[model samples]
Target: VNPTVFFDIAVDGEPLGRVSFELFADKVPKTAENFRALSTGEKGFGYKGSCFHRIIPGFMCQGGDFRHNGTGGKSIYGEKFEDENFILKHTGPGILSMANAGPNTNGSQFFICTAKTEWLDGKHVVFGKVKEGMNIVEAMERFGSRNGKTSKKITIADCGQLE
Candidate 1:
C-alpha cells in the first residue's frame, strides 16, 4: 500500500499550485516514513520552506533541502540513513528518489524524476510516485536553467499528508 502527501508550491512568492505524491510505504517503509514526516513537518524542521535549487528539464528536479537546497539537509533520524532498498524503478516522469553524495549518505534531500532515468535505478532509493500535478511540475521546469539552477525563485510553500 501507499500513503499520499502533497506540497503546495510557489514561484517567487506567487502561488503556483500543488503536487501530490503517493509514497510506496509497503515497499520502502523506512524511506517513505522519513518523507511523510518531513512533509508534515510535525518535528519542527522540514521541507516547508526549502527551495528546488537544482532542476533539469527532460531529467529531474531536486528539493527537500531544509538549508534551502544545494547545500544540505537532515533526515528525521538526526543524521544520514542507509539506502532502504532499490525495489522500485525510475521508469518515467514523476518518480521520486533520494539524493546523496554517495551510497549510505541519504539525508533529507530528494529529487523528482521528469524522465526515465534508468541509470539511476541501482544507485538511488526510489520510494514514491507522482499522484498528480505533473502540469505544475512541468510549469516549474520552465524556470530551470541549462545549468541546473532555477532562474526564478521557487519553493515548497506548504506540505503535509493528504487525508
Candidate 2:
C-alpha cells in the first residue's frame, strides 16, 4: 500500500470540494507512481489547473488533460503502460480510473465515476476512489449538458499530498 493522497478541485473559481484517494502501489506500482507524479507535479507534470474536459451525465467526468482538452496530455514517462490494479472494480459512483485509447494505453487522462459504470471494469485502470466530495462531482456531472459543452470550467486547483 502507498500513502493516501487528496485533490482539491474548484469549479469555475468557486470552492467546490476535495476528492481523496489512496494509491494502490502494491497492485499497480507503475500506474500508481505515474499518477502520483502527475498529481503532485513532482516532475513538472502535476494535474493542477487541468480541466475536466469530458463529462457524461449520470456516468462520469473525464479530465487531467494538461492541454485543457480531450486530445492533449500524456504520462510523465512519455509512454503508456499496461493496466494494473484491475482488482478494484468500478462497482459504484466515485470510482476513478485511467482514460485510455485502448489496452495498455494509460496516460494522464482519468475519469471519475459519477454513477455506477461496471461495464468499464476490465477496461480502464482503477487506481483511486473519490473518498469525499461526491456532491461536487455530482454538481460537475450537470456542469455540462452535452458532451464537451460544459459552460463552467472544471479545474483542479491543487492536487498533491494531503496535509
The estimated TM-scores of all candidates read: 0.97, 0.91
- Inter-residue clash pairs, candidate 2: 41-46
Cα lDDT listed for each candidate: 0.92, 0.81
> Over the full model, what C-alpha lDDT does candidate 1 score relative to the true structure?
0.92
- Clash counts per candidate, in order, are 0, 1
For lDDT, the strongest prediction is 1
The stretch of ten residues in a row with the least summed lDDT in candidate 2 is 1-10
Q: Model 2, range 18-119, lDDT digits (tens) per residue?
A: 877777777777878888888888897769888888887887899878978888788977777778657888888888789999898887899888778888
Q: What TM-score, to 2 decimals, does candidate 1 have?
A: 0.97
Model 1 lDDT tens row, 8-120: 99999999999999999999999999999999999888899889999888899999888676678999998899999899998999999999988999899999998899999
